[PDB]
Amino acid sequence: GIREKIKLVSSAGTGHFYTTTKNKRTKPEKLELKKFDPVVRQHVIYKEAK
Amino acid sequence: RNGRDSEAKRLGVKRFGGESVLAGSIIVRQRGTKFHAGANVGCGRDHTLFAKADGKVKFEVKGPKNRKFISIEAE
Amino acid sequence: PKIKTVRGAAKRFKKTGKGGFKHKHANLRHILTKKATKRKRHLRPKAMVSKGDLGLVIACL
RNA sequence: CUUUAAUGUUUGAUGUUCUAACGUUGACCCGUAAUCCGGGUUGCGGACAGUGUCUGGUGGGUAGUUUGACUGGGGCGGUCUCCUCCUAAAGAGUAACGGAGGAGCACGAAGGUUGGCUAAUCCUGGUCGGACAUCAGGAGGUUAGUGCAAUGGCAUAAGCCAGCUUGACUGCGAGCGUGACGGCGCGAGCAGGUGCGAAAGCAGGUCAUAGUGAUCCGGUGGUUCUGAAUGGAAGGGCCAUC
RNA sequence: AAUUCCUUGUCGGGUAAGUUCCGACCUGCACGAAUGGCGUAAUGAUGGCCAGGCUGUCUCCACCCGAGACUCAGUGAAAUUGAACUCGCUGUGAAGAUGCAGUGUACCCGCGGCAAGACGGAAAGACCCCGUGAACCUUUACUAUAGCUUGACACUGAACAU
RNA sequence: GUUUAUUAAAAACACAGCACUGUGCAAACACGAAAGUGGACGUAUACGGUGUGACGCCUGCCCGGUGCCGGAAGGUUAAUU
RNA sequence: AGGACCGAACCGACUAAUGUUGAAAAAUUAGCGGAUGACUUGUGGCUGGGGGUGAAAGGCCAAUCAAACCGGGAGAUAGCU
RNA sequence: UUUUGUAUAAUGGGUCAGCGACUUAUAUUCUGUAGCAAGGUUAACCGAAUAGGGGAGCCGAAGGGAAACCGAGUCUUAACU
RNA sequence: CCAUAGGUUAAUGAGGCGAACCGGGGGAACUGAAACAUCUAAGUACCCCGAGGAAAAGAAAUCAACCGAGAUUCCCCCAG
Ligand SMILES: [Mg+2]
Ligand SMILES: [Mg+2]
Ligand SMILES: [Mg+2]
Ligand SMILES: [Mg+2]
Ligand SMILES: [Mg+2]
Ligand SMILES: [Mg+2]
Ligand SMILES: [Mg+2]
Ligand SMILES: [Mg+2]
Ligand SMILES: [Mg+2]
Ligand SMILES: [Mg+2]
Ligand SMILES: [Mg+2]
Ligand SMILES: [Mg+2]
Ligand SMILES: [Mg+2]
Ligand SMILES: [Mg+2]
Ligand SMILES: [Mg+2]
Ligand SMILES: [Mg+2]
Ligand SMILES: [Mg+2]
Ligand SMILES: [Mg+2]
Ligand SMILES: [Mg+2]
Ligand SMILES: [Mg+2]
Ligand SMILES: [Mg+2]
Ligand SMILES: [Mg+2]
Ligand SMILES: [Mg+2]
Ligand SMILES: [Mg+2]
Ligand SMILES: [Mg+2]
Ligand SMILES: [Mg+2]
Ligand SMILES: [Mg+2]
Ligand SMILES: [Mg+2]
Ligand SMILES: [Mg+2]
Ligand SMILES: [Mg+2]
Ligand SMILES: [Mg+2]
Ligand SMILES: [Mg+2]
Ligand SMILES: [Mg+2]
Ligand SMILES: [Mg+2]
Ligand SMILES: [Mg+2]
Ligand SMILES: [Mg+2]
Ligand SMILES: [Mg+2]
Ligand SMILES: [Mg+2]
Ligand SMILES: [Mg+2]
Ligand SMILES: [Mg+2]
Ligand SMILES: [Mg+2]
Ligand SMILES: [Mg+2]
Ligand SMILES: [Mg+2]
Ligand SMILES: [Mg+2]
Numbered sequence: 001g002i003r004e005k006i007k008l009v010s011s012a013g014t015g016h017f018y019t020t021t022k023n024k025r026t027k028p029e030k031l032e033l034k035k036f037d038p039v040v041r042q043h044v045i046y047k048e049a050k
Numbered sequence: 051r052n053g054r055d056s057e058a059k060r061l062g063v064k065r066f067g068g069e070s071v072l073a074g075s076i077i078v079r080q081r082g083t084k085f086h087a088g089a090n091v092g093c094g095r096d097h098t099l100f101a102k103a104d105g106k107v108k109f110e111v112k113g114p115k116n117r118k119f120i121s122i123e124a125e
Numbered sequence: 126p127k128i129k130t131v132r133g134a135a136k137r138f139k140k141t142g143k144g145g146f147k148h149k150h151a152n153l154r155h156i157l158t159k160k161a162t163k164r165k166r167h168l169r170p171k172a173m174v175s176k177g178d179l180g181l182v183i184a185c186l
Numbered sequence: 187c188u189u190u191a192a193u194g195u196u197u198g199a200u201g202u203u204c205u206a207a208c209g210u211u212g213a214c215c216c217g218u219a220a221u222c223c224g225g226g227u228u229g230c231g232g233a234c235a236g237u238g239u240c241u242g243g244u245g246g247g248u249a250g251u252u253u254g255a256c257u258g259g260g261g262c263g264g265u266c267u268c269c270u271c272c273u274a275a276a277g278a279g280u281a282a283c284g285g286a287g288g289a290g291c292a293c294g295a296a297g298g299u300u301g302g303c304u305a306a307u308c309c310u311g312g313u314c315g316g317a318c319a320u321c322a323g324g325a326g327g328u329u330a331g332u333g334c335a336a337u338g339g340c341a342u343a344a345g346c347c348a349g350c351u352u353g354a355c356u357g358c359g360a361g362c363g364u365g366a367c368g369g370c371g372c373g374a375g376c377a378g379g380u381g382c383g384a385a386a387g388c389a390g391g392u393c394a395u396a397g398u399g400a401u402c403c404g405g406u407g408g409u410u411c412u413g414a415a416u417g418g419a420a421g422g423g424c425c426a427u428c
Numbered sequence: 429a430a431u432u433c434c435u436u437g438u439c440g441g442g443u444a445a446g447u448u449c450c451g452a453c454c455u456g457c458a459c460g461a462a463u464g465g466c467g468u469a470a471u472g473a474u475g476g477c478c479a480g481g482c483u484g485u486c487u488c489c490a491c492c493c494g495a496g497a498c499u500c501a502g503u504g505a506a507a508u509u510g511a512a513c514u515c516g517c518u519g520u521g522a523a524g525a526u527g528c529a530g531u532g533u534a535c536c537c538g539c540g541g542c543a544a545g546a547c548g549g550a551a552a553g554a555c556c557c558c559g560u561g562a563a564c565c566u567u568u569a570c571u572a573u574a575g576c577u578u579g580a581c582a583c584u585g586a587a588c589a590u
Numbered sequence: 591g592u593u594u595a596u597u598a599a600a601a602a603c604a605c606a607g608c609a610c611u612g613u614g615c616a617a618a619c620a621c622g623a624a625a626g627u628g629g630a631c632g633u634a635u636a637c638g639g640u641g642u643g644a645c646g647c648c649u650g651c652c653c654g655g656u657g658c659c660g661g662a663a664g665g666u667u668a669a670u671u
Numbered sequence: 672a673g674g675a676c677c678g679a680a681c682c683g684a685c686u687a688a689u690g691u692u693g694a695a696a697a698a699u700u701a702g703c704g705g706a707u708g709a710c711u712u713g714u715g716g717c718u719g720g721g722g723g724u725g726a727a728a729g730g731c732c733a734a735u736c737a738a739a740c741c742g743g744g745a746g747a748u749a750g751c752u
Numbered sequence: 753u754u755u756u757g758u759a760u761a762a763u764g765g766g767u768c769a770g771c772g773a774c775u776u777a778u779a780u781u782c783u784g785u786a787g788c789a790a791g792g793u794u795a796a797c798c799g800a801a802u803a804g805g806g807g808a809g810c811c812g813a814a815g816g817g818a819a820a821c822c823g824a825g826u827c828u829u830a831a832c833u
Numbered sequence: 834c835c836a837u838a839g840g841u842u843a844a845u846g847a848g849g850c851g852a853a854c855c856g857g858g859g860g861a862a863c864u865g866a867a868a869c870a871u872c873u874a875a876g877u878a879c880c881c882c883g884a885g886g887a888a889a890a891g892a893a894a895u896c897a898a899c900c901g902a903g904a905u906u907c908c909c910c911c912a913g
Contacts, residue, residue: 003292005158007427015408019158019427020354022294031294036355036379041830043355043380053284056269059395060278060364074361074373081394082339096394097339098372100362127779127913142815151368151400157427159398163390164370166357169425170828177366183781
């Protein structure tokens with residue numbers, strides 16, 4: 001798998017991730033993204049792919 | 051080996067001038083902006099020109115570059 | 126000899142009030158991340174059985 | 187806790203001796219005027235061999251099955267899904283082993299927004315410097331670019347630069363289109379809640395059209411669901427996903 | 429050449445003339461040494477070639493003897509058969525005509541013959557294709573299995589040393 | 591000499607000779623789930639399997655592949671515990 | 672003495688013709704090979720179908736053989752006629 | 753009969769006469785008709801046996817949701833006009 | 834050596850035939866799935882053993898749900 005499928009786990013106390021695709025040979029770093037989380041229904045920073 | 055073709059995508063004008071249409075009715079499925087958005091018309095992300103209010107459909111020809119616009123009348 | 130039931134159709138269907146049957150959309154057990162949330166939000170509820178297929182459901186009942 | 191001794195210790199592995207289970211298509215006796223069989227004496231092996239159960243390898247010796255379709259007869263050759271143009275006779279659609287090409291990917295920016303800019307090619311002058319690198323001016327004015335094949339489109343730029351950023355958010359959907367169907371696609375607008383801009387406003391991914399896989403079966407996370415007497419649990423469902 | 433596509437390879441022989449045959453040459457498409465190689469006396473209802481004798485094989489058939497075929501009397505079948513008052517020619521046509529069109533010819537019926545046609549009769553084409561048909565057969569096709577083989581446990585013990 | 595009784599009698603089979611190989615007897619091998627037989631009332635000068643098929647000159651090279659023979663250092667490895 | 676030679680019965684079936692609704696569901700006529708051998712023959716036993724047997728052709732196993740015949744599953748299935 | 757199409761030289765039939773090919777049982781749905789009617793109706797069984805009991809049960813009047821659960825409403829959603 | 838094995842005699846019982854129904858020991862394939870191997874067809878067809886006018890099973894180490902029912906076999910519903 002060249003471009004590989006990963007997820008975006010919320011840093012809150014909520015068991016929710018989004019899901020997207022990353023590459024290996026372009027990004028050695030993990031992905032930080034602010035995103036909505038429908039438990040507290042606000043926007044939380046996301047990290048921890050897979 | 052040369053013969054091949056896609057499935058045709060059913061483009062064109064679905065509703066012509068002089069027709070009482072309803073809201074959100076698709077008028078034109080086109081690729082580019084060969085038909086241009088205008089009064090009461092949204093341009094889709096595939097440039098599907100879609101309607102916003104009830105009424106008729108009028109093909110105006112306006113603009114400095116002789117473009118083709120679609121509009122919805124009321125009366 | 127009573128009629129045998131198509132058990133797959135009995136699992137995938139259930140009857141509504143005016144004789145229509147209900148069913149559940151496809152494309153919802155695996156690959157979902159390359160798809161859109163708009164598409165999956167369309168797919169998530171249940172719907173009615175279409176026109177030409179009612180004979181091929183009622184015969185299965 | 188590192189490496190090793192005296193000896194209790196449950197047993198496993200190697201060699202040696204014994205005979206008593208087991209074998210004897212060695213001998214002798216009896217039933218018995220009998221080359222089967224049984225019983226006894228005796229000899230040689232002897233915990234080996236061999237039989238059953240489980241398991242690994244072999245296994246056409248043998249049994250049951252498969253080996254596709256289009257096709258200008260069949261087979262070999264080629265092709266089967268998706269996108270683009272023509273054949274398409276100016277609504278949509280329209281076949282052929284008709285003519286020509288591409289896709290089974292990519293991006294944390296190449297996305298959103300705000301502010302802003304406009305390319306190709308040629309000529310002239312200019313150190314190494316060259317037919318062509320980087321500078322300045324002129325003609326020209328999209329021939330260039332648009333992540334890629336083609337077509338349509340783009341100057342209010344959909345092409346290019348920088349800052350700020352996560353709307354590549356969720357739950358819904360009046361209505362429409364296109365397919366027999368499963369489905370696929372466009373979508374103003376509502377509630378919540380973000381980013382950009384002073385604001386009017388824009389943003390539910392990329393300029394669009396390909397970049398894909400039904401169901402079943404099972405994996406992981408969450409759960410105002412169920413829980414075969416009851417409370418739990420295993421499992422089943424639902425939501426998300428592999 | 430039991431093997432050579434081109435090929436009747438090329439050169440001698442035989443013959444008036446020989447794609448076959450015999451002898452030799454090598455450029456063996458693609459002989460080859462135990463799925464043997466090369467020679468071989470004899471043997472072969474074996475394959476090929478030549479020569480003498482011999483003759484109706486032939487030019488070119490002719491005559492004769494018997495058994496049928498023909499006639500008389502007696503017994504008396506069969507396959508096939510939509511129906512029939514069942515001609516030719518040219519043309520048309522499900523595309524090769526007894527039947528259609530046009531035209532020619534022809535008193536009605538036996539008998540002996542000959543087979544050119546009636547796409548004649550016999551067997552629902554064996555070769556061709558299709559059916560998601562069958563049978564057998566082969567293998568490093570798949571799935572299993574009898575069998576061969578390995579080990580553990582039970583049938584199964586007593587002591588000695590490591 | 592044998593063969594397709596019935597479209598094929600041959601160059602096909604078989605042969606004696608040859609070589610490889612399995613074989614220690616309760617042999618290998620075969621029928622048979624076992625018993626018991628054939629092997630043979632034989633005993634490596636015997637029996638089976640396999641190819642070539644009298645005789646004479648002979649029979650060359652290769653263990654890369656597939657199959658057979660030898661082993662017991664190492665890796666991996668079933669059931670059991 | 673000879674799987675010796677010629678040739679009767681005996682065994683077989685290489686060539687031509689007739690026959691091909693026949694005299695005959697494979698013959699007749701005229702020729703033909705072996706004829707003391709691995710032959711021929713009378714009688715009776717043994718081998719039962721995924722089996723036998725086969726000097727091997729896929730030949731024979733009751734006029735039927737790439738798996739006999741009979742009775743069953745059986746009104747097998749038949750997108751074919 | 754099969755066909756795009758047959759006088760077709762594509763198939764089948766020599767002729768007559770007899771026989772011969774969409775039936776049966778239990779389920780479901782639709783139509784027509786008869787009864788009753790927010791009701792309808794029994795089956796197995798008892799029974800001077802088509803009567804009459806027997807109403808165990810099935811269908812219908814209320815659905816929605818996977819389900820707990822609610823109810824002329826129900827499901828999604830924190831929540832809908 | 835006793836005794837067992839064995840030999841003789843004698844009595845009682847059995848053998849075998851028969852349609853189907855029954856209890857068991859063995860046990861296919863065509864077919865269907867539009868092919869086929871899991872599955873089916875079915876423990877059907879078939880082979881074998883044994884008894885009776887009936888056979889087998891049969892008085893609970895069975896169900897249910899905190900109320901309880903009370904051996905076995907047969908029919909109708911639950912229920913396609
Ligand atoms: Mg309806
Ligand atoms: Mg799912
Ligand atoms: Mg096979
Ligand atoms: Mg089978
Ligand atoms: Mg094909
Ligand atoms: Mg037109
Ligand atoms: Mg068009
Ligand atoms: Mg701007
Ligand atoms: Mg769960
Ligand atoms: Mg329980
Ligand atoms: Mg020669
Ligand atoms: Mg010459
Ligand atoms: Mg050779
Ligand atoms: Mg030879
Ligand atoms: Mg001979
Ligand atoms: Mg006439
Ligand atoms: Mg003519
Ligand atoms: Mg004649
Ligand atoms: Mg004919
Ligand atoms: Mg036929
Ligand atoms: Mg045929
Ligand atoms: Mg013959
Ligand atoms: Mg012959
Ligand atoms: Mg030979
Ligand atoms: Mg050699
Ligand atoms: Mg002789
Ligand atoms: Mg002689
Ligand atoms: Mg042969
Ligand atoms: Mg052959
Ligand atoms: Mg025969
Ligand atoms: Mg067979
Ligand atoms: Mg049957
Ligand atoms: Mg039949
Ligand atoms: Mg036909
Ligand atoms: Mg027709
Ligand atoms: Mg006509
Ligand atoms: Mg005719
Ligand atoms: Mg005809
Ligand atoms: Mg006929
Ligand atoms: Mg009649
Ligand atoms: Mg009554
Ligand atoms: Mg099938
Ligand atoms: Mg009893
Ligand atoms: Mg109690």
